Design an enzyme around this catalytic site. Structure first.
Site, PDB file in Angstrom:
ATOM      1  CG  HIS A 161     -54.171 -33.364 -41.786  1.00  0.00           C
ATOM      2  ND1 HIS A 161     -53.764 -33.326 -42.948  1.00  0.00           N
ATOM      3  CD2 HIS A 161     -55.528 -32.701 -42.838  1.00  0.00           C
ATOM      4  CE1 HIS A 161     -54.138 -33.502 -43.212  1.00  0.00           C
ATOM      5  NE2 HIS A 161     -55.334 -32.995 -43.485  1.00  0.00           N
ATOM      6  CG  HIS A 206     -59.266 -35.534 -44.570  1.00  0.00           C
ATOM      7  ND1 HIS A 206     -59.252 -34.932 -45.365  1.00  0.00           N
ATOM      8  CD2 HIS A 206     -57.884 -34.696 -44.344  1.00  0.00           C
ATOM      9  CE1 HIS A 206     -58.784 -34.114 -46.295  1.00  0.00           C
ATOM     10  NE2 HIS A 206     -58.150 -34.081 -44.976  1.00  0.00           N
ATOM     11  CB  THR A 254     -52.785 -29.910 -47.416  1.00  0.00           C
ATOM     12  OG1 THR A 254     -53.999 -30.513 -47.040  1.00  0.00           O
ATOM     13  CG2 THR A 254     -53.161 -28.389 -46.889  1.00  0.00           C
ATOM     14  CB  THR A 255     -52.851 -34.287 -49.938  1.00  0.00           C
ATOM     15  OG1 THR A 255     -54.500 -33.867 -50.436  1.00  0.00           O
ATOM     16  CG2 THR A 255     -52.590 -35.036 -48.302  1.00  0.00           C
ATOM     17  CG  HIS A 278     -58.630 -30.049 -43.908  1.00  0.00           C
ATOM     18  ND1 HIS A 278     -57.582 -30.962 -43.988  1.00  0.00           N
ATOM     19  CD2 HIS A 278     -59.179 -29.127 -42.925  1.00  0.00           C
ATOM     20  CE1 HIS A 278     -56.467 -29.508 -43.660  1.00  0.00           C
ATOM     21  NE2 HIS A 278     -57.114 -28.593 -42.934  1.00  0.00           N
ATOM     22  CG  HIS A 337     -52.268 -40.796 -47.589  1.00  0.00           C
ATOM     23  ND1 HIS A 337     -50.961 -41.148 -47.961  1.00  0.00           N
ATOM     24  CD2 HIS A 337     -52.728 -40.649 -48.317  1.00  0.00           C
ATOM     25  CE1 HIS A 337     -50.429 -41.263 -48.582  1.00  0.00           C
ATOM     26  NE2 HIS A 337     -51.744 -41.371 -49.575  1.00  0.00           N
TER      27      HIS A 337
END
Ligand SMILES: [Zn+2]
Ligand SMILES: [Zn+2]
Lengths: 249, 249
Positions: free
Chosen positions: A95, A93, A188-189, A118, A66
């Site tokens: 995005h 991580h 958010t996952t 994040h 992801h």
């Protein structure tokens, strides 16, 4: 579950964001859009105390199917910042997307940036420090270790290591970590647990275009390495009733 | 006024520590001797928030006839740490002697160290962060800029500049800045104003023997450069009534 872009293949359909299980359909969700003028000031939101961010280490990374997940394991932690208790830094991580805009999950006054980093902290429930990343004409040395290690975690579930570096060098200078926004939310996952205290900083981190492009060019969503990793962002969630605070007066 | 060592010359007598004017003869004075077992714990004494310590700069230094004074001018400041308000970092200096012991002004359980570094902060009354320095077998890169610039400020009132460096690199790692002692006191040099909040850290900074010896070998108290600068420490003052706190439980 998968992001919108992953459900575009004629075969192999899976759960898009609009069909996520767990607490994903709940009331207080993230990301959100911050409307600067509607934020309330709260004096207690003083700069965080960064413990262990100055320690150079070899950070173990991996393509978790992801994003690029960099494990921290508590080598560092944060105290204060009107947080209920002390939080241990577990992982980091990002995005990202295709261009200089529409790449960050949150937005400040309807504006999206290139990427969003994040830093998740486990309550020693979740304290996530979110930073926006902007593309510039200058190479950011602090991001070099991560960039160099991407070519190794190209394939999903790959594992590797980042050369000796500290969390500090990736973040913007301390004089820029005064202004931030705080609000209750969730991951958010999936399963989108609504047990997160968010701190989104106003000042973005700046990296070169070539360091930026390196992410989608190297990471893949699938085994056969057909889909490059990008657009791994969740669309904006409704604010609902909660309020968003600003550290500044 | 001058330190004990300066009144040893048969000619040119001046005011020794025992004959200092101003508030020097008052009740709440510094330095002091910290008796670890008699210190009371205070939860509010959480690690300080260091703003601007990570910024590399060219720091202007000078031999102020009493020590090496490095001007900071507010390029950095501290917030929190149960302090009444925010304090701007004005200057930095040190006190040292002849050997590995009896060189620091304060003492922790009757033990003195090689040197003591003082970071003075002006209330934006005085917040002074005191660190003990120990001599070791390892070169401390963070102290190199200061050491290299000493040969230039040999003569009293000389002025010079230290190459690009940050306050952070001189201090011990953040994971070592948890334990400290706090007490009300005063400056340890005339007029000894009793308007200081002291924070003396438990963990000392370690520098090489050659970086240590460099101080007294290069600095002088007088114009004719006859007296090398050392033993620029004030003797221990009586505790009186006040209490000394420890951040740790
Ligand atoms: Zn995330
Ligand atoms: Zn001093």
């Amino acid at each position: 579950w998968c992001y919108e872009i992953q459900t575009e293949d004629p075969r192999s359909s899976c759960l898009g964001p609009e069909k996520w299980p767990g607490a994903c359909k709940e009331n207080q969700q993230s990301p959100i859009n911050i409307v600067t003028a509607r934020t309330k000031v709260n004096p207690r939101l003083t700069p965080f105390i960064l413990v262990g961010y100055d320690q150079k280490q070899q950070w173990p990374i991996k393509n978790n199917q992801h994003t690029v997940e960099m494990t921290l394991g508590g080598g560092a932690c944060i105290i204060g910042g009107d947080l209920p208790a002390r939080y241990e830094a577990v992982q980091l991580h990002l995005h990202w997307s295709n261009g200089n805009d529409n790449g960050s999950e949150h937005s400040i006054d309807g504006r999206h940036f290139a990427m969003e980093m994040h830093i998740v902290h486990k309550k020693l429930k979740f304290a996530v420090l979110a930073f926006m990343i902007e593309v510039g004409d200058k190479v950011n040395k602090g991001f070099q270790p991560l960039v160099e290690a991407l070519p190794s975690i190209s394939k999903p579930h790959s594992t590797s290591t980042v050369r000796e570096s500290s969390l500090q060098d990736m973040l913007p200078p301390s004089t820029k970590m005064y202004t931030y926004f705080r609000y209750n939310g969730s991951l958010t996952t999936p399963n989108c647990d609504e047990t997160v205290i968010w701190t989104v900083y106003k000042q973005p981190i700046k990296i070169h275009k070539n360091q930026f492009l390196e992410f989608s060019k190297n990471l893949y969503y699938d085994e056969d390495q057909k889909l490059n990793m990008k657009d791994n962002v969740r669309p904006l969630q409704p604010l609902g009733k909660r309020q968003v605070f600003k550290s500044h007066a």
